[PDB]
Design a protein around this motif. Structure first.
Motif, PDB file in Angstrom:
ATOM      1  N   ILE A  26       0.831  -1.200   0.000  1.00  0.00           N
ATOM      2  CA  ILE A  26       0.000   0.000   0.000  1.00  0.00           C
ATOM      3  C   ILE A  26       0.868   1.253   0.000  1.00  0.00           C
ATOM      4  CG2 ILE A  26      -0.219  -0.159   2.527  1.00  0.00           C
ATOM      5  CD1 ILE A  26      -2.932   1.083   0.041  1.00  0.00           C
ATOM      6  N   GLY A  27       2.005   1.211   0.704  1.00  0.00           N
ATOM      7  CA  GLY A  27       2.932   2.334   0.668  1.00  0.00           C
ATOM      8  C   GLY A  27       3.555   2.532  -0.702  1.00  0.00           C
ATOM      9  N   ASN A  28       3.940   1.432  -1.357  1.00  0.00           N
ATOM     10  CA  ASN A  28       4.440   1.521  -2.722  1.00  0.00           C
ATOM     11  C   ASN A  28       3.384   2.095  -3.662  1.00  0.00           C
ATOM     12  OD1 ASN A  28       6.280   1.080  -4.875  1.00  0.00           O
ATOM     13  ND2 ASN A  28       5.100  -0.744  -5.432  1.00  0.00           N
ATOM     14  N   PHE A  29       2.146   1.613  -3.536  1.00  0.00           N
ATOM     15  CA  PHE A  29       1.010   2.198  -4.238  1.00  0.00           C
ATOM     16  C   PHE A  29       0.977   3.713  -4.065  1.00  0.00           C
ATOM     17  CE2 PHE A  29      -3.560   3.363  -3.954  1.00  0.00           C
ATOM     18  CZ  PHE A  29      -3.946   3.068  -5.249  1.00  0.00           C
ATOM     19  N   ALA A  30       1.083   4.179  -2.818  1.00  0.00           N
ATOM     20  CA  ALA A  30       1.047   5.617  -2.569  1.00  0.00           C
ATOM     21  C   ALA A  30       2.213   6.332  -3.253  1.00  0.00           C
ATOM     22  CB  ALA A  30       1.041   5.892  -1.062  1.00  0.00           C
ATOM     23  N   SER A  31       3.397   5.704  -3.282  1.00  0.00           N
ATOM     24  CA  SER A  31       4.542   6.338  -3.934  1.00  0.00           C
ATOM     25  C   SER A  31       4.324   6.468  -5.433  1.00  0.00           C
ATOM     26  CB  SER A  31       5.824   5.556  -3.662  1.00  0.00           C
ATOM     27  OG  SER A  31       6.294   5.815  -2.358  1.00  0.00           O
ATOM     28  N   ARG A  32       3.784   5.425  -6.062  1.00  0.00           N
ATOM     29  CA  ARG A  32       3.558   5.488  -7.499  1.00  0.00           C
ATOM     30  C   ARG A  32       2.509   6.536  -7.837  1.00  0.00           C
ATOM     31  NH1 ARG A  32       3.316   1.096 -11.230  1.00  0.00           N
ATOM     32  NH2 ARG A  32       1.968  -0.341 -10.035  1.00  0.00           N
ATOM     33  N   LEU A  33       1.470   6.654  -7.005  1.00  0.00           N
ATOM     34  CA  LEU A  33       0.524   7.752  -7.187  1.00  0.00           C
ATOM     35  C   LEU A  33       1.215   9.103  -7.033  1.00  0.00           C
ATOM     36  CD1 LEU A  33      -2.646   6.389  -5.437  1.00  0.00           C
ATOM     37  CD2 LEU A  33      -2.187   6.657  -7.878  1.00  0.00           C
ATOM     38  N   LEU A  34       2.155   9.208  -6.089  1.00  0.00           N
ATOM     39  CA  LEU A  34       2.917  10.446  -5.928  1.00  0.00           C
ATOM     40  C   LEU A  34       3.630  10.824  -7.221  1.00  0.00           C
ATOM     41  CD1 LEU A  34       4.026  12.701  -4.103  1.00  0.00           C
ATOM     42  CD2 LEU A  34       5.981  11.242  -3.631  1.00  0.00           C
ATOM     43  N   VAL A  35       4.408   9.892  -7.772  1.00  0.00           N
ATOM     44  CA  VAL A  35       5.158  10.167  -8.991  1.00  0.00           C
ATOM     45  C   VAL A  35       4.213  10.464 -10.150  1.00  0.00           C
ATOM     46  CG1 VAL A  35       6.787   9.141 -10.635  1.00  0.00           C
ATOM     47  CG2 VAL A  35       7.137   8.860  -8.176  1.00  0.00           C
ATOM     48  N   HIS A  36       3.026   9.858 -10.149  1.00  0.00           N
ATOM     49  CA  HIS A  36       2.097  10.080 -11.252  1.00  0.00           C
ATOM     50  C   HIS A  36       1.446  11.457 -11.174  1.00  0.00           C
ATOM     51  CE1 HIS A  36      -1.190   9.662 -14.052  1.00  0.00           C
ATOM     52  NE2 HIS A  36      -2.080   9.693 -13.075  1.00  0.00           N
ATOM     53  N   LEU A  37       1.121  11.929  -9.960  1.00  0.00           N
ATOM     54  CA  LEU A  37       0.373  13.173  -9.802  1.00  0.00           C
ATOM     55  C   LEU A  37       1.251  14.416  -9.712  1.00  0.00           C
ATOM     56  CD1 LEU A  37      -2.642  12.303  -7.477  1.00  0.00           C
ATOM     57  CD2 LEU A  37      -2.625  12.952  -9.871  1.00  0.00           C
ATOM     58  N   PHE A  38       2.553  14.264  -9.482  1.00  0.00           N
ATOM     59  CA  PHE A  38       3.499  15.380  -9.493  1.00  0.00           C
ATOM     60  C   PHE A  38       4.555  15.174 -10.578  1.00  0.00           C
ATOM     61  CE2 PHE A  38       2.253  17.704  -5.664  1.00  0.00           C
ATOM     62  CZ  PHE A  38       1.525  16.760  -4.966  1.00  0.00           C
ATOM     63  N   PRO A  39       4.149  15.040 -11.844  1.00  0.00           N
ATOM     64  CA  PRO A  39       5.148  14.731 -12.877  1.00  0.00           C
ATOM     65  C   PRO A  39       6.196  15.816 -13.033  1.00  0.00           C
ATOM     66  CG  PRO A  39       3.099  15.379 -13.898  1.00  0.00           C
ATOM     67  CD  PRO A  39       2.814  15.254 -12.429  1.00  0.00           C
ATOM     68  N   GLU A  40       5.835  17.075 -12.786  1.00  0.00           N
ATOM     69  CA  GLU A  40       6.795  18.160 -12.930  1.00  0.00           C
ATOM     70  C   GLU A  40       7.907  18.109 -11.887  1.00  0.00           C
ATOM     71  OE1 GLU A  40       3.727  18.305 -12.110  1.00  0.00           O
ATOM     72  OE2 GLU A  40       3.515  19.408 -10.229  1.00  0.00           O
ATOM     73  N   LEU A  41       7.790  17.255 -10.867  1.00  0.00           N
ATOM     74  CA  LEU A  41       8.818  17.133  -9.840  1.00  0.00           C
ATOM     75  C   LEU A  41       9.734  15.933 -10.033  1.00  0.00           C
ATOM     76  CD1 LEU A  41       6.725  17.927  -6.638  1.00  0.00           C
ATOM     77  CD2 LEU A  41       8.062  19.529  -8.034  1.00  0.00           C
ATOM     78  N   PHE A  42       9.418  15.027 -10.960  1.00  0.00           N
ATOM     79  CA  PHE A  42      10.181  13.799 -11.161  1.00  0.00           C
ATOM     80  C   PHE A  42      10.818  13.738 -12.550  1.00  0.00           C
ATOM     81  CE2 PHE A  42       7.295  12.822  -7.737  1.00  0.00           C
ATOM     82  CZ  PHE A  42       8.105  12.150  -6.842  1.00  0.00           C
TER      83      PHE A  42
END
Length: 102
Positions: A26-42
């Motif tokens: 579930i934490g990994n899930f949250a991280s992938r959502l992070l990278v997906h929703l803040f593309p300008e930061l990654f």
């Protein structure tokens, strides 16, 4: 969530099940959502390194609307994440790490 009505960045149920089923926790899930929703930061510029969830420890704060969306998607799978102590102790650290890592 009716609050999110009219938003243009939401994920469907089949999409959420896909992303969760290809995550390792579930934490990994949250991280992938992070990278997906803040593309300008990654990008190659790694602006993520200036941010964390709270704006603590001298970092900038990640957009609370998008974090609120990630916590909503997580709560769908992990209802105890509706509890602020669970969200703080079991998710904010992993998100800050995803922002910070080399």
């Amino acid at each position: 969530d009716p609050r999110n009505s009219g938003s243009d960045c939401l994920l469907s149920k089949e999409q959420l099940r896909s992303i969760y089923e290809s995550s390792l926790s579930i934490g990994n899930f949250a991280s992938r959502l992070l990278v997906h929703l803040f593309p300008e930061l990654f990008t190659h510029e790694n602006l993520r390194k200036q941010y964390n969830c709270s704006g603590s420890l001298g970092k900038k704060q990640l957009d609370p609307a998008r974090i609120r969306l990630i916590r909503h998607y997580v709560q769908l799978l992990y209802p105890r994440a509706k509890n602020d102590r669970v969200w703080t102790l079991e998710f904010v650290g992993k998100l800050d790490e995803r922002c910070r890592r080399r």
